[PDB]
Symmetry: C2
Subunit: 828 residues, 2 copies
């Protein structure tokens, strides 16, 4: 018999810490007397073939260091037991405890580490014993015989039965539709359509919460301020208060209601551009502030010291470099390639431009952007048909997706809408020139279709109409960026992958341990987004052009455009006509826009990631038969298509999962989206939209040339800047958006950067640890490649007088709003 010492390290903390500290509803009641431990053998009883009996041991307290308590248990294990493959834990305390890790000592051949990083419920809440595996990873068919049944049982435990209201201690991962965003029990004006489950509103599923349905609106799930996620996905409880989720929680439920308390007039615009400059210079006095000093610690870039507090915004990086760049047309076009939404521009392949909408409903489909209008601005270089053949015309085209909403959005007080197109021309020095913006209003109110084209002009009136048309198009791009490029294609579509990973891949599965850092933090951020960002009267509705139709439009974009096989960066660039496969070219891709900072730097990250994923997959899957025979892997991919993205389960574009290369393609796509895609659309938000006239979230008024009256037109001619002010966000909308965007762009102190620190199971296997080291080195090299590109005067889309260097895909960064740094996961 061998003597064994079990050391259990527990973190000192409590759930729901921040809510109290900032005032929205003892230390001795926290920790328990003892913990029951059971060591589990990796091998079944030889000869009998049944599972050996776990050997128990109760564990008691010992020391307290660095905010972490140790629990100790000295026991003895028979020698015919074999290696230990897992440990079972039961909490006898009446409250949950957070277990950091477990070390088994006294073994000759070495210490045995278990990575817990989990809350262990009070047995009185859930009597089921928790199992923790060693850092050794196994395909299902390689599971040690003594662990095969416990592996399957734990998966059964996390799947649950698809019923019941989820309790805070549950660990059950399952799907449901977005039926929780409206508030019909509060007003029928807060009623919202269910997103997911129909041909008309397709949508990714989210984590099932199972709260009771409303009696007023039986399709709506009742609202709660405590939105369930499985217990360990609520990372905010064991992170510092500067953690992303904690800072965003504080902004949405403390700072924003405080803003709404001092800026009560919801229709008060800025009367002067100087008043906009005050947001950054003098700020806003907010006398209302519960626990004001705590917020000064949590949000130092926002809440400043003094019984009352000052809300004051930092200068956005765009303005620190060039106070005037926001109205230069070349910076407008530069930002389609290097700004916060690099995902919309595509190649023009058909000419003239023509809508696909039913002309019997939406009016004449021919674009008002004419060949002669184009040649007026490019002919000193080339003709239109020349430009088409040489891939020099590019477009951002929101016409067909936005026009079906115009009539309805225009019924909302304080906003309007157009179908819009922005046309660009790639010059000889590889910089974009904006050629035209077209704005359409469909036939409605008995009037016919309204349609105009605006261009940079030689005279003041057309020049001002151009500026107002940019404001409208920019507001459409803000909505598309926030709802589609950002919310839909990262946050929203990823949550079903997370759910399926926990439902179908065992915690000891290698692909689970590969995906895990890329999936942390996201489910909890998304739950807060459903509670306060994309809900009825939430942040986006209150400040973006489409109002209450904002989230529906992301459903339409999902149904119309989203497919898994174009989410990887090469396939996205190819799909938009920006690249063609070319063995001669860097990365195998010939770019029709050669200086495209987002895409140039993204392909460096894509290759580095792919090579890491290749090394990892090849370590565990030596051939196609090992892929096809992995029942967990196959069940995982199947559930992603059939439940997570159920509304697209029948589409033909889903990749096969039959070879190791198939798996590499699938994983690289997922983890590129959660790291670099999200980073590129997320951490530049304050830099470019913090000074909101550069990127307004809403254009509140129609163009003066839309059915003008003599008196309105004369107002426009007299004081055109006042038309822009009346069109730009209100003071309340500006403060709310700036507050949220500053938080979203901020790297928390404990941000986990792509390829900086390895996972426990990765560092436990020498060949994986080595591959991670090569990955980390590749990323550090990429840092140096990007830094040189930002000093290259030939790359005018990232280097120039007053130009912001493109750093959003530099992997590593310090804390704060730095404009660089790529986390593993969607963390904010």
């Amino acid at each position: 018999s061998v003597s064994v010492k079990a050391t259990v390290t527990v973190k000192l903390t409590v759930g729901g810490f921040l809510s109290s500290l900032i005032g929205l509803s003892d230390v001795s009641d926290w920790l328990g007397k003892t913990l029951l431990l059971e060591v589990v053998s990796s091998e079944v009883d030889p000869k009998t073939g049944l599972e050996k009996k776990p050997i128990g041991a109760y564990a008691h307290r010992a020391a307290e260091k660095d905010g972490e308590v140790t629990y100790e248990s000295d026991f003895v294990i028979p020698d015919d037991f074999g290696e230990i493959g897992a440990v079972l834990v039961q909490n006898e305390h009446h409250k949950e405890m957070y277990l950091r890790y477990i070390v088994l000592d006294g073994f000759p051949n070495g210490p045995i580490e278990f990575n817990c990083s989990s809350w262990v419920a009070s047995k009185f809440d859930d009597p089921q014993k928790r199992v923790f595996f060693t850092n050794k990873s196994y395909l299902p068919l390689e599971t040690p015989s003594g662990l095969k049944e416990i592996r399957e049982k734990e998966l059964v435990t996390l799947r649950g039965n698809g019923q019941g209201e989820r309790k805070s201690y549950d660990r059950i991962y399952d799907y449901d539709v977005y039926d929780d965003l409206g508030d019909p029990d509060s007003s029928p004006e807060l009623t919202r359509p269910v997103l997911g489950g129909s041909k008309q509103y397709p949508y990714p599923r989210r984590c099932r919460t199972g709260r009771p349905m409303s009696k007023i609106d039986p399709k709506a799930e009742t609202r709660s301020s405590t939105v369930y996620v499985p217990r360990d996905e609520a990372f905010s409880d064991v992170k510092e208060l500067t953690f992303s989720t904690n800072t965003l929680y504080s902004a949405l439920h403390a700072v924003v209601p405080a803003i709404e308390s001092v800026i009560t007039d919801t229709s008060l615009g800025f009367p002067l551009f100087t008043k906009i400059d005050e947001l950054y210079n003098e700020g806003i006095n907010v006398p209302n502030l519960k626990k004001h000093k705590v917020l000064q610690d949590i949000l130092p870039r926002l809440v400043r010291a003094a019984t009352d507090s000052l809300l004051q915004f930092e200068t956005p990086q765009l303005l620190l470099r060039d106070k005037f760049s926001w109205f230069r047309d070349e910076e407008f076009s530069r930002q389609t390639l290097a700004g916060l939404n690099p995902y919309s521009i595509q190649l023009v392949k058909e000419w003239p431009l023509k809508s696909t909408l039913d002309p019997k409903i939406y009016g004449p489909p021919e674009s008002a952007i004419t060949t002669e209008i184009v040649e007026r601005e490019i002919k000193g270089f080339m003709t239109v048909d020349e430009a088409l053949k040489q891939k020099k015309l590019f477009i951002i085209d929101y016409h067909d997706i936005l026009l079906p909403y115009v009539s309805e959005v225009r019924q909302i007080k304080g906003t309007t809408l157009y179908g819009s197109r922005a046309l660009f021309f790639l010059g000889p020095d590889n910089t974009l020139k904006p050629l035209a913006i077209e704005l359409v209003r469909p036939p409605m109110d008995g009037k016919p279709q309204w349609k105009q084209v605006f261009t940079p002009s030689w005279e003041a009136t057309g020049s001002w109409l151009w500026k107002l048309a940019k404001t409208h198009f920019l507001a459409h791009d803000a909505g598309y960026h926030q709802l589609v490029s950002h919310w839909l294609r990262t946050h929203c579509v990823t949550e079903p992958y997370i759910i399926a990973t926990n439902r179908q891949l065992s915690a000891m599965h290698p692909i689970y341990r590969l995906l895990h850092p890329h999936f942390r933090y996201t489910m909890e951020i998304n739950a807060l987004a459903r509670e306060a960002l994309i809900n009825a009267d939430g942040i986006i509705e209150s400040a973006f052009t489409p109002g209450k139709y904002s989230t529906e439009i992301s459903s339409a974009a999902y149904g119309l455009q989203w497919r898994f096989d174009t989410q990887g960066l090469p396939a996205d660039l190819i799909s938009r006509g920006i690249a063609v496969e070319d063995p001669s070219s860097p990365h195998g891709l010939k770019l029709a826009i050669p200086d495209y900072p987002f895409a140039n730097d993204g392909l460096l990250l894509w290759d580095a990631i792919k090579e890491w994923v290749t090394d990892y997959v090849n370590f565990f899957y030596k051939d196609a038969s090992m892929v096809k025979s992995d029942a967990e892997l196959q069940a995982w991919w199947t559930e992603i298509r059939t439940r997570g993205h159920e509304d697209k389960k029948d589409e033909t574009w889903w990749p096969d999962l039959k070879t190791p290369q198939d798996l590499i393609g699938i994983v690289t796509t997922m983890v590129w989206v959660t790291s670099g895609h999200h980073a590129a659309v997320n951490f530049g938000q304050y830099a470019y939209a913090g000074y909101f006239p550069n990127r307004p979230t809403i254009a509140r008024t129609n163009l003066p040339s839309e059915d003008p009256t003599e008196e309105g037109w004369r107002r426009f001619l007299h004081k055109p800047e006042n038309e822009l002010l009346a069109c730009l966000p209100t003071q309340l909308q500006a403060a709310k958006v700036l507050t949220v965007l500053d938080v979203l762009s901020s790297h928390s102190p404990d941000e986990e950067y792509l390829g900086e620190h390895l996972e426990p199971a990765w560092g436990a296997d020498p060949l994986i640890k080595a591959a991670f080291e090569r990955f980390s080195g590749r990323l550090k090299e990429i840092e140096g490649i990007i830094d040189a590109r930002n000093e290259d005067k030939n790359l005018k889309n990232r280097h120039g007088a007053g130009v912001v260097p493109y750093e959003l895909l530099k992997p590593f960064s310090g804390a704060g709003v730095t404009g660089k740094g790529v986390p593993y996961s969607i963390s904010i």
Copy 2:
């Protein structure tokens, strides 16, 4: 024997009132005087002897006291055989001078006899010779009544003086003398300036002789003085209100400006933020040494408010559009409708080429190229089609500026280039800027530096374009202020005024036609040679050429100024903007059809010319009457040979032999004093009050001129700090903004072209009728212009955020209205 009563009306006031009120240097009781000796002069000689009858006397005695108008009174008796009275002589017994408004003779049966005096009558102790005032009837010299021939010629002798002496206060002597009082070589060899006028290298219009002693350290320099002499009646400030243009400007240059120079002590302190520039208009500067005046808050309300607060009003350009000053289309629109519409000219020859000495100034070929231009315009037409169809236009300062670059570049706080700016007229008749070329001549051993800048699609070329615009705009500011404004109006006009008083009798009809167009100018120019264009004056302290600024105006004078291109039609033809075409409006086909200054100016030209035609034709029935007018002939000769002596030999001076010749000369003169001056003067604060739109100086070189790796990186990192470093200092900005707000303000007693007539004009029925037609034509033009500013097809005056072009509307109220055309150069 007829009994007549004289009613002299004298205004209660004293000379130099402002200088006391502004605390820099006798009580209402002692102001006036005791008696006034009046002598009536008959217009007819003795029909027997043919000798002049003697004048009938009478002492006038202080009689009444009303309305700041004290009247003297004198009853006396005139013989039956005296004749119609043609003049009255006046003598002042008081030790102080006095200012008479008018003299009325009551009693004669044919009506009252009214004498317009409007003049200061000195003490007999300073000048004993008595003062003659004529009736409002006008006479050519040969038509002079017999009893007035000798008095007429001797008043002219009195006004001319003896070409020597030092001019005293009470003097009324008009005479010429060169520009040798701008330097101050007697307080630094640095504050020394050359003499303008006299040399084939420093030609210049003459100015009013002051007589003050020469320089103990420099033979060719006149002493400096706190009182600059103009003939006594030309010092109109003494009888105008404190709000009068000359009074407000005296306040600014001698009170406000020194107070600013007392706080803002760092002559190199730039603006650290653009937000600091905005505070000029929204918060002001605290200026302490201003409550020493507390009169400034009444005289300069737009400026001196409430340690006193100097705050500036928002210029009109920014009221319409905070952002128009960034826009390339507003830059180009202002060559046609801004404060300097006189520089743009048609490109006739391509390619551009310098006329300067290649072995001193480098290759003369321009870096503007056909392929460079076609890169922007081929969407509309080729270069050859553009020159053939008159679609390319230029403002070219290269050859005049390049010779000064090396010397100006030795001045700390400034630099210089030779510049060209090229434009293209598109199909809706709006201009687009194509390129600016900046040139530095070979100096310091380096070759010629020459770069062309254009509107760009990339941030670096666009910021270099912005910086090139700043330099070009500084050059246009200097050329506007020194040439378009100072030289071609104020400066070249003063000799006309001098010659008119020297050679045309006050009773001469052309004297009386010209008088309102010449009022106020001489006193303003004296204020200018004392505080505006002097060594270390306002211009030198804030304008790109610094100490070389006035010389450049002499250079443009010598190189370019000719009398026969100063009329508006001849100016337009000379610049290639217009060709003579009987079938176009005004007989002129305009290459730039929507050209607000030229369109509106030709309306005024035609209205003025028809008034002058009517007046001249009333008095000169044929060429013989023009040829035999010894006064008129001596007038034109003195203007050529003495007023503009350095050009007296040029072949372009018009002849003066026919009524039509006279109409052309006068119309040219009075267009310049009214519409020309108004168009370059009263939009100054509107366009240059927000000085980044029109900076008076560009203090730093382009970053692309022999760049260092480090400086180039500063430029890339924070390009708006390059622009701040180039833009005027906080001292320079506060000085120019002060001056321009004053120059752009119409005093309340501003006399607008064709509103009120002169006394002699209203006295003759056909002249009055002709004036009424003139006045109506002008009122009509107001409504023509008002409609033009509502025409959306006239994109150069109508559009979103665009300042209407109102600078040549004839009538206005007081203040900085941006409209209204005075008779004269009044500010």
